[PDB]
Structure formats: C-alpha cells, structure tokens
Symmetry: D2
Subunit: 309 residues, 4 copies
C-alpha cells in the first residue's frame, strides 16, 4: 500500500519487449510515439534496435533516431532510468528483473495476450494510464527477490531471481536426493523430483503447480515446496525472509542435480557444490492498476481459476 | 528474540481435573517458592479437593496469592507464566490475557505438542536459566476478532473456524478483505488462522506449515465445493470482514479456538485483524530448531 | 451398455417443494399421455394445491396413477423413471427403491449436475428415443449400509456416500475402521466418508478424493480433515465389507448421515457395516458413459479448464 | 484367489540384481535349499557370468547343476513354473519385463526395506518356500498396462507391458509439455505441465503416489491418470475403467517434443505424429502374498509409506 512518489519528475523510461514477436511491433512504436510526444528519453535494448522491422520502416521519424541505447555494457548506473515499461507476458518482467541486478526502477508492465500475473495494466487506452503513472501517483508492490550464490568446489556465482529457484534432476532418471539446511541446521532431506525455493511473487508461478499455497506478494516470507516428494507427509513450508537456506547434495548421493533460476541458466550441481539462498535487499517495485489486494485477487480469478463457482 | 531479566512474580497454569498433573505442579511450586518466586494460581486451583487437602503441601499452599482477572494490574504484577499440560493450557492462558501477555514457559507431560517445547525433566535448571534471562522468545501473533450482531471482542491464538455447527446444509459465506468482496466460500466452512495455528486444525484442512515468525494471516477452506480453492495467505495488516451471503437460507456457527461456539445469522459480521498484543513463548534452544523439531515429532512431517 | 424393452408404464418424480417445475411437469405428463403411456406419481404431488387447481390438466391429472411407496412391490409396475430437478431428485428416487431400480432418465432445469445428463429442451425426441430402447445406461453401484445399535438393525441403501462426523456435538471424532474383520485404521478428525464411484464427484470430492468413473467397481474411503498429514484417500475392492465403530477409548458419540438425510447418533457398541449393494441404479446417459461423465466434469466442477 | 497347481511345481526361476553383493549368501542358501528339495533352478546368463557366483568351491556342485534361462522360447514352452525374486521392487519390475506374455506366480523376498511388491521376508525362508510349493498361498493378480508406441517417420511400432506406470514428461529438455489425452477416440483433455502418469493400481503407491494420486488396492480393475505438476489448480487425478483405450499424443500446436518412460527404463522421445496407446494387458502378474491381499496391502502401506500413522 505504497504510493509512487517521485523525488524528481521522471524523464527517462526504459522500454523492454519480447523479441521475435511480430504482434508486439505495432504497439511498441505507438508507445514510443507517445513517449517522444511527451518529451522523454526512451531507452531500448540494442538487441532489438537492430531488428530489420524496427529500423527499416517509415516509423523512423524523430523516435527511432532518438532511441538511446540501454547501458547494457557492464552496469553503468541504475539512476539513468526512472521507470520501466514492459510489453508482453511475465517472461518480459522476469527478463527485466534479470537485467537489473541492483536497485530496480519501478516497473509498469503491459499485457497483450493473456492477463498474466506480473502484467496488471492493459494496453487499451495506454496514454491515460501512462500520464497518470507519470504525473500522478500509483500504488506499487515491492516484490521481494531471492539472492542466490552457487559455490563449486571454489568458484562462486551470484544470481537474483524473482519467481523461484528449482533444484531438480536433469537427464538423470533417479529421483534427486538433496539436503536442505536452514541457518546452518539440517532442516530436512528432499527425496523426489525436486525442491522449489520461491518468493511470494513466485507462489502463483510453477510453485503453485506443486501444491504451494497462494501468498500475497506483500507477505515477507520464503516458500519451500517439494516437487513430487517421495513421502506423503511432506507439506510445503513457509519460512521467515531473514533466514539463509543452504541446499547441498547428500554425502551418499550417487548422481548430480540441476538448478534453474526462473527457468533459465540451468546448471549442474555436483558433490561439494552448495546453493545459498537469502532474501535480496533490492526488491522489484511493480506498479499496480488500482491497489495490490484487488489486483492480486483479480489476477487469481483470471490468470488462475481460484474459487470459481 | 532474547528476553530481559526476571523479577519475583510467577503465574502457574495447569489443566484442571487431571490427577497426573498433581505431583509435578506442587513440586514445581516447591522449587518456585524455594528461592525467591511468588506463585499465582487460579481461584479454582485452590478449590481442588486434593491440592488443599495435602498436609505436606499445606505449608506451601499458604503463600498462594490468587490470580484474579480484574484489570491491567494483574498483568503488571506477573513477570512470566508457566504452563503444565498440552497446548490447550497455553490456549487457556492466552484467553486469560486479552491485553499484554507475559512470556509463557510451557511444559509438556504427555505429547510434545507445538506450544509446549520444554520438558519437565530437569526442570530446575531450565527454570533457573529462564530466571537468569537467557532464553529465546517467539512473538506469536494473535487475531483480534470482533463479532457485531451488541458487539463482542475476542483474542484468538490458534484460529477462528466458521462452519455449519449444530446445523447442516452448508451455506454460503462472503469474505471481505479491506472492504472488497474477494471470494464466497461454499463447503464445510472457512478457517482464519495465525501462523501459530498453521499446524493446528488449519493443517488438517490442507494448509501449509508456516513458521510463527512470518507476519501473515491464513485463509483455509474446510472442504470447499470447488476444486481450485487453494488456501491463501494475506498480509497481517489487512482487515478481514466475514458476513453471511445475502441469499443464504440457514445460519452459520463461529468458534474461537474451539470454544465459545456462537451462531451467526443475517446482519452479523465478523471482523478479523492482527492483534497488537502478541503472545511471547519461551524457546528451548532457538525458534527455527524448536519449530522444526516439533514439526518432525508431532506431525511426522517428512518423516520418510 | 445398451438395453431395450422399456414400454408402457413410467414413473415421474419431481421436487416436492413448489418451484418452476410445474410447467415442465405438466408438459411432460401431457406428452406421455399422448404417447399412450401410464404415468405414476407420488401421493404428495397430487395433494399439491397448484397441480390440482387448474382446468388445463383435467383428464391428465385424473389419469395420474398414485405410486405406493411400499404397499405394492413395484417390480413390473414401473418400467421407467423420469426425474425432474437436480441430483437431489435422483437421490430421492434411489431412496424410494430399496430393491431393483428401473432405468432412470433425469432432466436438469438449473445446473447440469452429474446425475442429470438430459436437457429438458426438445424432450419429446429424447423420450421417444428412450422408449424405442436406443440409449446407453450406466449401472451406478450403491452401498448397502446396516446400523446395529445396543439389537435393532437398519437396512439403508445409499447412492452418493455415507458420512460419519462429529454431528451436532463439537468434539472431533475418533473412530475405527475394519475391513473383513481386520482393523484398517483409526480415523481422527472431522470424520470419514465411504462413497461409491458415483459419489466421487459428490461431497467426497470436496475432501480431496480422486474423480472415479462410475464404471469402476470400487469403494472409496476419504477422511474429512484428518489429524495426520499422511492420511490419503484410499480405494478398496467392491467386494469388501467395511465396519466402522467408535473406538473403545472414545469419550463421546459420533453421527452418521446417509446422503445427508438420516443424521443419527452412533454410540459405544453401535456398528456400521457397509457393503456393495446388488441392486445398482441404472442411470440413462445422453451419448455414452465416458463422454457424458467428462462433459459433466467439465461443466459442473470446472476441471482442467484453461 | 489361491494357488492351484495342475501338477506339483518342479522348475523355478530365481531373479536377483546383478549389481549388489549382499545377495550372494541368500542366493546361495536359497539355491541349495531348492536343490535339496528336488527342484530345477533357472538363472539368467549374467548370473552365471558373475565372477563371484561361479568362483565358489562350495557352490560349484549346484552351479554346475544350474540351468540357464534363455530370454526367448520361454513363452512358447512354459518351462518356468514358479518365480522367486531377491531384492527390492526393481527386481520384480525386471521380472515382469522379462515375461511379456503369461507370467508364472512370483514370490518376492526383501532383504532391505519391506517395499510393496516384496511381501515375504527372508528369515525362515525354508518353511515359507515349502508352504508355497504345494500349500494354498493367496495371490494377487496385479493388472499390467499394454503400451504400444506408434512412431511416424510406414511407421515403426513397438510394444511394451508395464507394471508400475508409464510417465510422459518434458524429458531432458524444455520447460513445459502439452499432450492431448483421448479415450476411445474422444479427446479427454490437454495435459499442460510437467507431465502425466498412466498407472495401474499396483503403481498407485509408486511414483503416481508422489504426484497426489490415491492409494488403490491392486484388486480394483482400473487405470489411473495423474498429472505431474499440472498448470491448473483444478486438475485432479482420474480413475477410469480398465477396458478403455487411452491415446496420448503431442498437441498439434506443440513446439517441443516430449519423453516417455516405462517403469523408469527405455526413456524414448515422442515427436509430432507419434502416439501412445495404453490398454489393459490381459496378462496380469500373479504376486504371492504372505497372509491375505487386504492385510498384506495395508501392512505394506503402513510400513513402507507411513500411511496414517499417529
């Protein structure tokens, strides 16, 4: 229930859209046509700036020539972007979260096909909504993110995920057998298809398919959900956000495991490797249409079919 | 997290009408009155035909300042509470204190339970350690429930359950969250629980185990008519309002912690929030380890 | 499977309470009379003031043969049952016939329902087809339940399920379940449900049971809010004989309901013996058992709908 | 159902996993007892080829008195009359895979965990074997699934008979799977998610149990369909009559292939145009039980699976 307050009037907006999608080509230009008409800097990923349809078109004008390239080189500074506009499904928002590994500017996501969960706004009558979110204030949800450190026995890698982290099997057929520690204490041993460590944002994601309870994104917590546990008594856990999970292979594990962050960058976990999961200090602010509760329940009713008569 | 020092004031709560608790209680009192403590007991406790008739314990029973639930002076005059028995005793102790709750140190004599982490064996050392003020504390949040039909206010530790009660023919109940109709429950009923109640009755309805340090409120349907009514978790700061559906024919029944079951008819509403007076429960070693040990031993969670 | 030889007499059942069923009932009775059929009705609907107080019916109302519940053994008296209303009407019809049940065709006026496949629109063609023996039937198995007190016995027959719970009392139930004299388990919690595959989509579904096609010979045991996390609904062969009784350590009674009608108390020494009845209900399907069952799953309880 | 021998059994087959070492002594003791009981003992060629079984001076006589079990010609000539399995349920699955036709009665022994398909305990095995030789021992006719894969490249068709289940999943790739599931030519649904499991009642306590299915007694004639992590909250496991003919095939709008596994082996890819036909095999596996089908099933359910323990 936090209103979007600007210390200074926003002037630079980063626009992110799913590539290799013709249906998104026409709206995107229009959005930029409005943003240039509003006298604002527009940042576009150079990957799609070179697309033949985007470049070789009559829509060049003063928009394409003024498409400032996004600072994809290293990280530059996140203060160069005031807020982010996403076109497409929740995958676009996940990609935007992956792009910004530090402080994330407020994100205003638009949906063109299904409503989804991370895309509350609708592209119809987008001019009024954009003007309201720029001049006036809008409700935002500070969706927490998971900070993950993978240690190979010692190479270290760091990621930040928004939906979940899935530790499962890969090409192997034997059910995975891993050990989960919480604050240095061996909380449990997961035997079966795998385990999911998710944020409340990811509660309605793939974690929901495994039987986890739907959690409002304003609840500070971390969900542990087993994918097809071997035991009947394994019930999903909800633990405080301040804890530090550590997932390892059991000392008697015959084979390896595979870890995926938001469905991408799937990498193998062997003996001596560890996955440390905490709550990140850089949550993603997602701009809501009316209010967090109403938007969340509307998405539950539409994206899922939660409690339909 | 950690607890401060301990002055000389102890309230002892035990399950009434249970012979097996007679021997430990007095023994505990024998240790409490031994060094510096003042033992408070209920009026009914002194009315037991066996506690008072004990000639050996009669000398100790003289210094048995009776606990009267009169006003806030009782709360200010008690430093911490010792409970003997199952989780029902701790629920009773929570019901006694509708305001600020002194820290609760619960012992178990039979099953381990979730709210009774301590074991009565070698209790002297544990009590002395608690007196020294070196014990972990879990601030279990409680629900403030207002029933409007005349208004009544209740403090709930485990959960509130709305169901058919003595009647039958399951009805329709509308759930309002911050004034917005979010859903309509159809089935055996609904459970609005706190994280401490996650392992309670709410667990039997398919809810998820939630650590008591998570600020949240759980809504869990008891046998919902639809197949997609998955239990939900909402922020602690919200204000639930529960009313009978305007098209409902028969009434419903609401129970707080399994006691004081009362009927809800048309025009009656139930307002549920997060109480600002949480119950502090003393931990054996630490919140996480104690919670997982209780989860493994009581519910046999992930035993295989 | 299919069947033939269903001419002549037909029984009609509808919701006893007055509702919008009056006009469809009158139209159906008129059409059946026009087809030289014999229409049986229960004495309750004849005494209804709305049905009797109209000049439109006249001879049709005068030709309504009354249906004796148990005075006459209705073996060849009824060769066809037509139900109007929801699944409750079909449950009532099952309750009426404690022995062999004639084939039953059910029409729905509100929700589709699992037990009401036919639609009242264009009912003349459907009734003509079912008269000519050109429809497929599903033999829904039923439970034979005997309640033994402490000497008297009862002989209930159930189509959906039998539910054992805490009833009007508030204390949670602690009961014991035996199969063929061997103690299966102890149910602690809100209660237990013993259901037929027909009742799988009923109240048993709300307790987490699996949807079972009514052509599977089986008996489902499903716990209502079990105290243990590992209690999972089970399916046992139809030939077994369940026996449910209060545990000797129980401090309070339980309550048993048969399709939510006879909420009667079960005390110490009372037993409930459940078997698979040898008198199944021959429901009539529109197209075929599989397609009708999956259509009902899609419509009634929105299932795998995306 | 109880064992009824037209003639007194004389030839038995012993099956054990060729990777463990703790089974050598029980295998030797069982073979010596069977030879002493005037019985013919069959083993697979891999058992004879084992460097440890053959290199035993004490066991040399019975090793030379063995009789190798040819994989072929066993269906035409019903030489095997009684099967004994040593090890976990995987040994019984392997024994089922060996016999693609009529299966002789199977008496499974467990050496570690109790399991589900291994009813007997090796302690006092001599008395149990003597009782099962001629005495009326109750058996359970566990139904099996006949699964044929039609692969369009004039299309090669394979055929398998599974005991536990058949699992269609995303395989060693992809993120989600969309597979259309039919029944008697009528499209049931479109499984969209991690995958689907088509299982027998015997497999109800297998992998299918981990996916949320319901425990089914192996005497119930049925086929279970259980979704592995369905994308919809409303997908609930189905139980369909054993006489149906399931047809699973990739959706015409699918982009990536799927993978099918039969009892965790022979994991093969399913592409566009390929179909999987699943029916009841009509060649059930008779598993010999210790006391009684219901009692043994509930004992295994309580011990191995910790079902409703308080």
């Amino acid at each position: 229930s936090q209103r979007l307050t600007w210390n200074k009037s926003p002037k630079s907006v980063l626009v992110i859209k799913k590539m290799r999608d013709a249906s998104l080509l026409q709206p995107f230009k229009e959005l930029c046509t409005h943003l240039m008409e509003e006298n604002m800097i527009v940042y576009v990923e150079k990957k799609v700036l070179e697309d033949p349809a985007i470049a070789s078109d009559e829509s060049f004008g003063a928009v394409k020539k003024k498409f400032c390239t996004f600072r994809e080189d290293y990280d530059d500074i996140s203060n160069q972007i005031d807020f982010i506009i996403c076109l497409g499904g929740d995958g676009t928002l996940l990609y935007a979260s992956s792009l910004f590994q530090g402080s994330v500017p407020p994100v205003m996501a638009f949906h063109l096909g299904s409503l989804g969960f991370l895309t509350p706004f609708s592209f119809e009558n987008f001019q009024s909504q954009v003007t309201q979110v720029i001049e006036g204030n809008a409700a935002v949800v500070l969706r927490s993110r998971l900070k993950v450190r993978v240690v190979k026995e010692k190479q270290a890698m760091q990621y930040q995920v928004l939906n979940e982290v899935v530790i499962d099997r890969g090409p192997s057929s034997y059910l995975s057998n891993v050990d989960v520690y919480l604050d240095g204490h061996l909380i449990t041993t997961v035997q079966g298809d795998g385990v999911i460590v998710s944020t409340p944002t990811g509660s309605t994601a793939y974690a929901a398919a495994a039987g986890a309870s739907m959690i409002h994104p304003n609840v500070p917590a971390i969900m542990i959900t087993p994918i097809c546990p071997h035991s009947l008594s394994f019930r999903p856990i909800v633990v405080p956000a301040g804890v530090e999970l550590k997932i390892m292979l059991s000392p008697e594990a015959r084979n390896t495991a595979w870890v995926s962050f938001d469905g991408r960058k799937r990498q193998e976990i062997r003996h001596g490797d560890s996955i440390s999961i905490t709550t990140s200090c850089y949550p993603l602010p997602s701009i809501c249409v009316r209010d967090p509760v109403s938007d969340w329940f509307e998405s539950l009713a539409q994206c899922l079919h939660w409690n339909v008569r």
